[PDB]
Design a protein around this ligand. Structure first.
Ligand SMILES: CC1(C)CCN(c2cc(C(F)(F)F)nc(NCCC(=O)O)n2)c2ccccc21
Lengths: 13, 207
């Protein structure tokens, strides 16, 4: 679930 | 605390098989941004946020395109702006579930003029599903669910006091949404199995 797990995390450009 | 204002704010802030898949992939990125705007969702453990969105994503998208489609004549308006009508649903093999969306969701949302605060609250209830498997503390999710529906009931009773049964009427569209979400997901897994879906997408991960 790499995409969802990343998307949920704050601090993205 | 769980204000319906913030739930409404979250709503307002956000070949047929290929059209459906492209449209679902788009809305999955949007659905994560919606979920973060729901009060206290982002305060759950990150692995529980993953579990809730994996368990509810297809119901959450179906509720939204059903409400979007209340003004469309005998069809479904996808988030890409493309329509699904009965001919193309049958050519995708999903004619029967298309009819069920119209008769159980769109027409009934239209009949009662379900508004966007009510839609947002039903979607937040779906999101906070305490039966999702593997949650670190299911009761924490049940706790948030109970705050959402407390806020929904007070909202309905204030705005629509002449309709005392309206709150239960809303919640009693959720079994239909659960049926219909299960069947849509079955077709999606089939499309993927036979190689009819776009590759390397967020949608592929959800499946
Ligand atoms: C009912 C019907 C004929 C309509 C389209 N569709 C789905 C299913 C999903 C979902 F993934 F939620 F199940 N999504 C989206 N569209 C993206 C959201 C948006 O466009 O707003 N479309 C679908 C899939 C299988 C079987 C029948 C259907």
């Amino acid at each position: 679930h790499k995409i969802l797990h990343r998307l949920l995390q704050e601090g993205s450009p | 605390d769980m204000p319906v204002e913030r739930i409404l704010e979250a709503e307002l802030a956000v070949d047929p098989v290929t059209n459906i898949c492209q449209a679902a992939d788009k809305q999955l990125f949007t659905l994560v941004e919606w979920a973060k705007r729901i009060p206290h969702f982002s305060e759950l453990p990150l692995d529980d946020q993953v579990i809730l969105l994996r368990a509810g994503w297809n119901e959450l998208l179906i509720a939204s395109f059903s409400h979007r489609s209340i003004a469309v004549k005998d069809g479904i308006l996808l988030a890409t702006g493309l329509h699904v009508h009965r001919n193309s649903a049958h050519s995708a093999g999903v004619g029967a579930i298309f009819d069920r969306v119209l008769t159980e969701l769109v027409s009934k949302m239209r009949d009662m003029q379900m508004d966007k605060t009510e839609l947002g609250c039903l979607r937040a209830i779906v999101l906070f599903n305490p039966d999702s498997k593997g949650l670190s503390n299911p009761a924490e999710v049940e706790a948030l669910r109970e705050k959402v529906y407390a806020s929904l009931e007070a909202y309905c009773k204030h705005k629509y006091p002449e309709q005392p049964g309206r709150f239960a009427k809303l919640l009693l569209r959720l079994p239909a949404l659960r049926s219909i979400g299960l069947k849509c997901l079955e077709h999606l897994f089939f499309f993927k199995l036979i190689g009819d879906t776009p590759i390397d997408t967020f949608l592929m991960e959800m499946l």
